[PDB]
Amino acid sequence: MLIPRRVKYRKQHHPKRTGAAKGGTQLAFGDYGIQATEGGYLTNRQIEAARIAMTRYIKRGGKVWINVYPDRPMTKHPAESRMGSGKGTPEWWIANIKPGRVLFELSGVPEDVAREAMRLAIHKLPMKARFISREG
Amino acid sequence: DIIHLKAEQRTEFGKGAARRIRRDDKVPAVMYGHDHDPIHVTLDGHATLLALRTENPLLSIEIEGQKPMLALPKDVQRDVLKGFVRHVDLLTVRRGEKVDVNVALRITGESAPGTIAMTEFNEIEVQADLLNIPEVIEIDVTGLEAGTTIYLGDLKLPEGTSLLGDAEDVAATVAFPET
Amino acid sequence: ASSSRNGRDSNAQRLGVKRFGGQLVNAGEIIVRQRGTHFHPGDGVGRGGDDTLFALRDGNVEFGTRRGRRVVNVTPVE
Amino acid sequence: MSKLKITQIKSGIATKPNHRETLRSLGLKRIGDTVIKEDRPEFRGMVRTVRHLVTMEE
Amino acid sequence: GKTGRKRRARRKKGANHGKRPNA
RNA sequence: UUCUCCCCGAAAUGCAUUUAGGUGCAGCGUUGCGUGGUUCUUGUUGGAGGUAGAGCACUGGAUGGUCUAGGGGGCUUAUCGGCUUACCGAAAUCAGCCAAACUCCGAAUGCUGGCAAGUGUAGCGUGGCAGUGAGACGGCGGGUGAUAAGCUUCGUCGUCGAGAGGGAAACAGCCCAGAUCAUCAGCUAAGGCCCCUAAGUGGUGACUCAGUGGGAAAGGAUGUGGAGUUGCGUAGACAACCAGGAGGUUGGCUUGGAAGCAGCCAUCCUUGAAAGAGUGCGUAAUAGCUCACUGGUCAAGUGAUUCCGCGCCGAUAAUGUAGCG
RNA sequence: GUCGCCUCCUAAAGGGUAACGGAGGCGCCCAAAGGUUCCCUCAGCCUGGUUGGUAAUCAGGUGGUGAGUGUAAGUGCACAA
RNA sequence: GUCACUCAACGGAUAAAAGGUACCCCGGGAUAACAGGCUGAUCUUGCCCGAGCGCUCAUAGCGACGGCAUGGUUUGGCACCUCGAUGUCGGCUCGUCGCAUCCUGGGGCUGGAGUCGGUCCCAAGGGUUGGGCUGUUCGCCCAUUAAAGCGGCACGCGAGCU
RNA sequence: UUUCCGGUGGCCAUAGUGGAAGGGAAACACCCGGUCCCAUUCCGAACCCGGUCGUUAAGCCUUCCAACGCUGAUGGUACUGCACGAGGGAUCGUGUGGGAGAGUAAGACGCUGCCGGAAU
Ligand SMILES: CCC[C@@H]1C[C@@H](C(=O)N[C@@H]([C@H]2O[C@H](SC)[C@H](O)[C@@H](O)[C@H]2O)[C@H](C)Cl)N(C)C1
Ligand SMILES: [Mg+2]
Ligand SMILES: [Mg+2]
Ligand SMILES: [Mg+2]
Ligand SMILES: [Mg+2]
Ligand SMILES: [Mg+2]
Ligand SMILES: [Mg+2]
Ligand SMILES: [Mg+2]
Ligand SMILES: [Mg+2]
Ligand SMILES: [Mg+2]
Ligand SMILES: [Mg+2]
Ligand SMILES: [Mg+2]
Ligand SMILES: [Mg+2]
Ligand SMILES: [Mg+2]
Ligand SMILES: [Mg+2]
Ligand SMILES: [Mg+2]
Ligand SMILES: [Mg+2]
Ligand SMILES: [Mg+2]
Ligand SMILES: [Mg+2]
Ligand SMILES: [Mg+2]
Ligand SMILES: [Mg+2]
Ligand SMILES: [Mg+2]
Ligand SMILES: [Mg+2]
Ligand SMILES: [Mg+2]
Ligand SMILES: [Mg+2]
Ligand SMILES: [Mg+2]
Ligand SMILES: [Mg+2]
Ligand SMILES: [Mg+2]
Ligand SMILES: [Mg+2]
Ligand SMILES: [Mg+2]
Ligand SMILES: [Mg+2]
Ligand SMILES: [Mg+2]
Ligand SMILES: [Mg+2]
Ligand SMILES: [Mg+2]
Ligand SMILES: [Mg+2]
Ligand SMILES: [Mg+2]
Ligand SMILES: [Mg+2]
Ligand SMILES: [Mg+2]
Ligand SMILES: [Mg+2]
Ligand SMILES: [Mg+2]
Ligand SMILES: [Mg+2]
Ligand SMILES: [Mg+2]
């Protein structure tokens, strides 16, 4: 689970889900990547599930990078309660993903096994994603 | 090799004009250099795509009225999701003059099965010549393991291509598997 | 249930620039309410106890720089 | 000075108040009403403020 | 629900230019 | 809360309130007198800004690399000291990042002055009379709520309120358009032109065969039409049909059986035109059928991959077809 | 739970703007911590030095604001406020 | 000139004031309880990926970690009709509808030898018991049956009854 | 008039930080003293006074270096006023105007006013 050591403000407005990726649209760590073609909120559990999928498929070879960190706290209203009486406490940690953001990087592994591992990892994310490489 | 690209003059500027140009299967480009003002041209989209398939290619821009001009594509604005080239910066070059470029990196070594090698950079700064642009620079790491590191100061560089960037940073790293 | 432990805000203070560049003012007219000296008093402009900048004479407001300071001047009307 | 000919083709109902005062300033009162203005930058600015409501000729 | 989805779908008709009262 | 017509025509906001469905003052209506372009629109010329966007300079958050002060565990053995530092590792630095309460930056708009033109007759002062101070929906920018509500609370524009006419099947708030009356004249707007239903079963060129049109997701798929990139190919390509379709070698940790199909592995060598210590079926376990490849009659195209247009499945409530009126 | 006042965000780059929205403060203190005049520059880091160690005190270099500001926060202030 | 207010509910009804009402009495659907409406967190029913389990073997039967939806019968959220009354729980009586099928009918796959099953595909024609306890619905139990289905209809049905 | 230099402003890094070399005619500066006016929360270090000996070592000044820092287009892109359009929905696109931030090419080892000195 990725949870920040501490955050300045535990109750924050919802991150904007508008616009293409501000940065991190090009591979910078690995030789292959998962690039998000859709925006959304990527929770820490989805990140962990994708990481487990990639790491278990690729076994012992190469390294996996998580380019996105879930440091945005999303609050939850008290259950079965009416509206008002303040904001809820944080329940989920998310990363704000925009189309064109490289989510995961993979290296030290040939292209077919990399493709299969990243297919497995992509089937865990809530948005659409694609396999990218460094022009071969 | 020199790739010849047909270009024609660009006189409408703005997001709307660029949108129309890209809807007409073309690419906006600006060509700037040392002894002339920037020249705004538009290029064939597919020909530019094929020419920019390679990195650091020597282009000959052909404008009907004017003479041919030698150039290197310095900045290529591509679409992030699709692959289409959106804008080309063309730095004009002289035949008898050096050029600074970014040459590519790859690993072709084969270490012990447990340990794996990594590349820590994308492209590296190199001063070279026009008719000799190296395709890539190879670093072969075969049987080198543990905490060995490779910096940019000792690489088998080709002739005519000196080294410009800081030689005090690593480009390749071999290490144990991921634990 | 629970309750909100916030809810207090101070009244609006209506600070900011009251006379912009080139505006004709009388002597004593307030040019900007401010906390601290974001603007400094220039030529023909005085600074108040609450850092209010006011016209020391008749003329036209102009905003500029004097040495390293960002200042408001009131240039006398020709 | 080509004496712009401006005619109103759409109504002012449900447009921004800026657009309605622009139509009033041009001397346009009804859909299909026409005015002749001098070719000056202020009248061209008025025309391009409400270009979705008018047509212009010379 | 069918009723609400049809209410929100009615806004896609030609003479309503993408909008309708109550969405 | 009772007759008429003529002209104008709101508000559902702000502040305060033993106040919150009341009221006062202000805002918005009207009207007498006064002052007259002072208002408004556009252009142009100045001004302050810190939002959008972006960035990492500061403050926090953060991924990986290089290097390292210092902590852990052990050793010869500890008063040191060395062997470790293969574990952890502050900070420093390189690269990619994140922020309503971050900013080295920084719009468009809006706001506010000068000038110019245009302009309904707008604006302002001062008196008489008010009503209103329950708003609704829609577009754009936000907070609450779950990326919820025909939800709630703000900013701004529009409409309804208080607005008829035409369109949206019907359908306050959507679109067009603001009804002085008459007209058995014409042109148009939005929307339409096979019939209901006025006007084209219009012309030309493509696509769809799902009644898609005339609802929906992740995802699945030799549907179909088109456009690129790339591999093999009359030195004869892919499919089909005839022969070698196997040697040492039952290579190994297993497992009474892993000899080719339990899994993981260094993932070779050979009679040789030819073969992989092994891909499916078979199979207590071995046999075997048959795959990649080599020659033959034939033989003109075959195999991937990217994208685009329109389609398919996923699809799923209860009176009656019933998601084109 | 709240009720008056102050600071920041929401607040959409003038001002204003709501919710039982998100953060904090105040109901003081100071005869100097007011007035004026004159002078001075910090925190951090590095090195050397008795007690003394990371950190009391001294010396040299570096360091521009990261120190400080009676008190929240913001705007300011090193020309120093 | 100055002083006296936690008049702090801070524009400050009095100098001076706590509670009960099921004995209660005299506008609002501006506002709650039932039902309808919207939403769908929760609930429910499915599905996607396939780690792994199944002696071997992902997919006979399964299905971690994750992801996407249906329905609108649950608990809620909203407060849109109704407070010059929309009677409400359970049962009885009378039904009618859906299919997400409990039985009977047809089929594919099986870790289907047979007898029996499991599972998911069609399928709503007919059928789908009587009692003990409890106001119950629900549930446990007794004896059966081919089976003792799940839901909607104002949690169907009080100008039909209790 | 010009050249060099000493003061005094304006712009406030294109000016600074760093390096290398060179120069002092008048001026500046270190420097030498502390008797005198004056001073150190101790110290003639500093402030102040008397000199101008010695010295260009540092300040200062001239020149060279893009090295760190600073400045920085054109074009494109984000965004956006107004007008529309698309999607089941997060959201997206177009027309017509405006248009960054980053980055690239590049600039840059300061510009300028007044007073004075020496020589001309
Ligand atoms: C939870 C119940 C909700 C309310 C009940 C209903 C109501 O008012 N019912 C009445 C009821 O009273 C008698 S029948 C006893 C009348 O005959 C009947 O029509 C109805 O008005 C009584 C309160 Cl029971 N309301 C319309 C809604
Ligand atoms: Mg970046
Ligand atoms: Mg003062
Ligand atoms: Mg004061
Ligand atoms: Mg009227
Ligand atoms: Mg009221
Ligand atoms: Mg009133
Ligand atoms: Mg932003
Ligand atoms: Mg009100
Ligand atoms: Mg309102
Ligand atoms: Mg609204
Ligand atoms: Mg509402
Ligand atoms: Mg109206
Ligand atoms: Mg109407
Ligand atoms: Mg009709
Ligand atoms: Mg009229
Ligand atoms: Mg006609
Ligand atoms: Mg039309
Ligand atoms: Mg007809
Ligand atoms: Mg026909
Ligand atoms: Mg036709
Ligand atoms: Mg249909
Ligand atoms: Mg679909
Ligand atoms: Mg129809
Ligand atoms: Mg503001
Ligand atoms: Mg604003
Ligand atoms: Mg308000
Ligand atoms: Mg009060
Ligand atoms: Mg009293
Ligand atoms: Mg009563
Ligand atoms: Mg109501
Ligand atoms: Mg209800
Ligand atoms: Mg009803
Ligand atoms: Mg639903
Ligand atoms: Mg309401
Ligand atoms: Mg009645
Ligand atoms: Mg069925
Ligand atoms: Mg039946
Ligand atoms: Mg009932
Ligand atoms: Mg720049
Ligand atoms: Mg530009
Ligand atoms: Mg720029």
The residue assigned the tokens 């759409």 is D10
Residue E21 CA, nucleotide F171 C1', distance (Å): 10
Cβ distance C22 to C61 under 8 Å? yes
Task: Based on DSSP, count helices (H) and strands (E) in chain D, helices before strands.
Answer: 2, 3
Which nt is closest to the CA of D8, judged by C1'? F189
Give the dihedral sign, CA B56/B135/B172/A104: positive
Buried b (16+ CB within 10 A) or exposed e, A55-88: bebbeebbbbbbbbebebbbeeeeeeeeeeebee
Gap between the Cα atoms of A74 and A10, Å rounded? 8
CA angle (B48 as vertex; B45, B53 as ends), nearest 5:
125
- Cβ separation of C3 and A85 shorter than 8 Å? yes
In A, which residues are within 8 Å of C3 by CB distance? 85-86
Deposited experimental method: cryo-EM
- Reference A70, options A125, A131, A134; nearest CA is A125
For strand H, which nucleotides have at least one atom less than 7 Å from a protein CB? Answer: 37-41, 48-51, 64-68, 71-72, 75-78
Gap between the Cα atoms of B124 and D34, Å rounded? 67
Cβ distance A27 to A123 under 8 Å? no
Residues in Cβ contact with B22 at an 8 Å cutoff, skipping those fewer than 6 apart: B28, B45, B84, B86
B178 inside 8 A of chain A by CB: yes
Which nt is closest to the CA of A20, judged by C1'? I78
Which tokens is C61 given? 């407001």
Gap between the Cα atoms of A21 and B52, Å rounded? 24
Rounded to the nearest angstrom, the minimum Cα separation between C4 and chain A is 5
Work out how many domains chain D is built from and give that number.
Answer: 1
How far is C-alpha A69 from the geometric centre of its chain's CA atoms?
7
**Cα pseudo-dihedral B110, B112, B118, B119, rounded to 10:** -30
For the stretch C20-25, contacts whose Cβ atoms lie closer than 8 Å and that sit 24 or more positions apart, written own/partner, are: C20/C61, C21/C61, C21/C62, C21/C63, C22/C60, C22/C61, C22/C62, C23/C60, C23/C61, C24/C58, C24/C59, C24/C60, C24/C77, C25/C55, C25/C58, C25/C59, C25/C60, C25/C61, C25/C74
Identify the closest residue of chain B to A58 by CA–CA distance: B178
At B44, give phi and psi (nearest 5°).
Answer: -65, 135
Gap between the Cα atoms of A114 and A131, Å rounded? 9
- Reference B107, options B98, B99, B115, B116; nearest CA is B116
Which tokens is B26 given? 């073309």
**Cα pseudo-dihedral B74, B119, A34, B25, rounded to 10:** 20
For strand I, which nucleotides have at least one atom less than 7 Å from a protein CB? Answer: 10-12, 73-80, 82-99, 103-106
In DSSP notation, chain A reads ----S--S-SS-PPPP--SS-SS--S--SSSEEEEESS-EEEEHHHHHHHHHHHHHHHTTSS-EEE-----EEEEEPPTT--S-SS--EEEEEEEEE-TTEEEEEE-SS-HHHHHHHHHHHHTTSSS-EEEEES--
DSSP H stretches of helix in chain B: 15-23, 45-51
Gap between the Cα atoms of C48 and C34, Å rounded? 10
Domain that holds residue D23: 1-58
Q: What's at C45, amino acid-wise? A: V
DSSP state of E10: G
In A, which residues are within 8 Å of C4 by CB distance? 85-86
